[PDB]
Amino acid sequence: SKLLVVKAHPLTKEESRSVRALETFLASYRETNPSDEIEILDVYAPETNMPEIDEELLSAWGALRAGAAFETLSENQQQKVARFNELTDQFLSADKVVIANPMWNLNVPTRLKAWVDTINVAGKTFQYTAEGPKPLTSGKKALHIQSNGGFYEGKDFASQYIKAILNFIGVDQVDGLFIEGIDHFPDRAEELLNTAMTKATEYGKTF
Amino acid sequence: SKLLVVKAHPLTKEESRSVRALETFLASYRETNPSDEIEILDVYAPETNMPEIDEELLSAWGALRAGAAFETLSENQQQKVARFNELTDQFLSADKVVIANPMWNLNVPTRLKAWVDTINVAGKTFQYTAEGPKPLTSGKKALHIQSNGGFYEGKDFASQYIKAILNFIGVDQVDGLFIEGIDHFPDRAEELLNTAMTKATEYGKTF
Numbered sequence: 001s002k003l004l005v006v007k008a009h010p011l012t013k014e015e016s017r018s019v020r021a022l023e024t025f026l027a028s029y030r031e032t033n034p035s036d037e038i039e040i041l042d043v044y045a046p047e048t049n050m051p052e053i054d055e056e057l058l059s060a061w062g063a064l065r066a067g068a069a070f071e072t073l074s075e076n077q078q079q080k081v082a083r084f085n086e087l088t089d090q091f092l093s094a095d096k097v098v099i100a101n102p103m104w105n106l107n108v109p110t111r112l113k114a115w116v117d118t119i120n121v122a123g124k125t126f127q128y129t130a131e132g133p134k135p136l137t138s139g140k141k142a143l144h145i146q147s148n149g150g151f152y153e154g155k156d157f158a159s160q161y162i163k164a165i166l167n168f169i170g171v172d173q174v175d176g177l178f179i180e181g182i183d184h185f186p187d188r189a190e191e192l193l194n195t196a197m198t199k200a201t202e203y204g205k206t207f
Numbered sequence: 208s209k210l211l212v213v214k215a216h217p218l219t220k221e222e223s224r225s226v227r228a229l230e231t232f233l234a235s236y237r238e239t240n241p242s243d244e245i246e247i248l249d250v251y252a253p254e255t256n257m258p259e260i261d262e263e264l265l266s267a268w269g270a271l272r273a274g275a276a277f278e279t280l281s282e283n284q285q286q287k288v289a290r291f292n293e294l295t296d297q298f299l300s301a302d303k304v305v306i307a308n309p310m311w312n313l314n315v316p317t318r319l320k321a322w323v324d325t326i327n328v329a330g331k332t333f334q335y336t337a338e339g340p341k342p343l344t345s346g347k348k349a350l351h352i353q354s355n356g357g358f359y360e361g362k363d364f365a366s367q368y369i370k371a372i373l374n375f376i377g378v379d380q381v382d383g384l385f386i387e388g389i390d391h392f393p394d395r396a397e398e399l400l401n402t403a404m405t406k407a408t409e410y411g412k413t414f
């Protein structure tokens with residue numbers, strides 16, 4: 001019932017194949033699951049106030065490990081700490097997650113790594129046990145929508161990373177939708193885009 | 208001759224294992240090579256102003272590709288484009304590169320990814336061809352100094368990624384110094400840090 005949308009592309013559907021496939025997935029998803037809550041997290045939007053692990057955050061977390069009151073932190077630390085935590089709890093609230101990004105230099109875009117930093121939290125999404133770390137979520141589903149220049153066989157670093165992280169925190173069902181290969185064969189744009197658009201709609205009906 | 212230092216950690220040597228190893232290495236390197244130019248890029252410092260690939264940047268490149276004059280872009284787009292290029296030229300100008308970062312969630316810090324984005328540039332560090340993409344750089348050397356919570360047999364995503372990018376652009380010599388396992392074995396802190404320190408000084412002497 002709650003679908004979190006992580007939009008990890010700075011542009012809109014008109015400029016982006018990742019975002020276009022996201023939008024056709026979501027139209028199909030909404031029509032198929034009219035009662036589901038759909039929450040959008042646009043990690044590039046200025047309004048989102050995306051936290052970044054930085055000096056103030058690392059030190060806020062030390063200051064709290066030590067035992068300062070959340071009120072001994074600067075206004076700007078308390079804000080970052082609380083914003084970071086909002087993002088973790090948002091993930092925890094979601095039954096399903098859809099992530100949309102382009103492949104940029106064989107890794108996730110910077111703001112997508114920043115979002116991943118919020119979902120890997122000891123005592124929140126995973127825990128330390130005598131047998132090693134163990135997930136703290138179960139029953140979540142994820143869909144990774146990503147556009148690549150070339151054809152990777154789901155074997156690119158970015159999609160493997162997203163899957164490993166999601167698997168670590170207990171998201172065992174990870175689907176992919178990859179819009180690939182148009183940069184290599186621009187003359188197959190209509191055909192590849194059509195294939196991707198129909199796969200997006202179909203995920204809308206089954207995810 | 209010219210050593211570029213990429214420090215990708217928000218904290219100082221007093222609070223960071225990878226920064227402490229970096230500083231040991233640098234002290235030993237300057238002693239060994241007093242004539243070499245040592246330029247520091249601290250990706251987290253206030254002064255740095257490193258762009259990330261975002262809407263303003265992408266739309267700037269888009270406008271330039273459409274034939275618009277640099278001077279027609281917004282003042283901040285012009286700043287962003289120029290800074291991004293300055294970063295790429297800095298890498299091209301270095302004979303040797305040392306990168307120092309902690310491992311955060313099996314991957315590099317967000318701003319280190321932002322720095323990799325400035326070094327993997329069609330027409331400056333690699334090129335597309337009929338045979339495949341090919342490097343545009345020759346003769347460089349790299350040292351990757353990274354601290355990890357557990358023991359990765361150089362097999363972690365972050366250091367594999369860093370090695371992948373460097374090799375792709377023509378840097379065939381990529382050395383590693385990994386300060387690992389202290390989070391698992393705090394009682395071994397003294398020994399593990401001393402070992403790392405000796406390797407960092409030895410790299411200063413031989414790199």
Ligand SMILES: Cc1cc2nc3c(=O)[nH]c(=O)nc-3n(C[C@H](O)[C@H](O)[C@H](O)COP(=O)(O)O)c2cc1C
Pocket residue numbers: 009015016017018019101102103104105106107147148149150151179182183260
């Ligand atoms: C900064 C930059 C880096 C890129 N790096 C890669 C790369 O690692 N591998 C690849 O196959 N394509 C790469 N591409 C090409 C895009 O992945 C391809 O254009 C993609 O279809 C864009 O998705 P989008 O339309 O949602 O932006 C890169 C493109 C840009 C702008």
Ligand SMILES: Cc1cc2nc3c(=O)[nH]c(=O)nc-3n(C[C@H](O)[C@H](O)[C@H](O)COP(=O)(O)O)c2cc1C
Pocket residue numbers: 053216222223224225226308309310311312313314354355356357358386389390
């Ligand atoms: C945000 C965060 C994420 C981390 N993620 C990992 C992880 O993916 N794997 C791991 O082994 N250690 C992880 N650690 C532990 C650090 O890699 C480890 O403490 C390392 O020695 C820190 O290096 P530094 O002293 O230079 O900061 C993480 C620590 C933090 C602060």
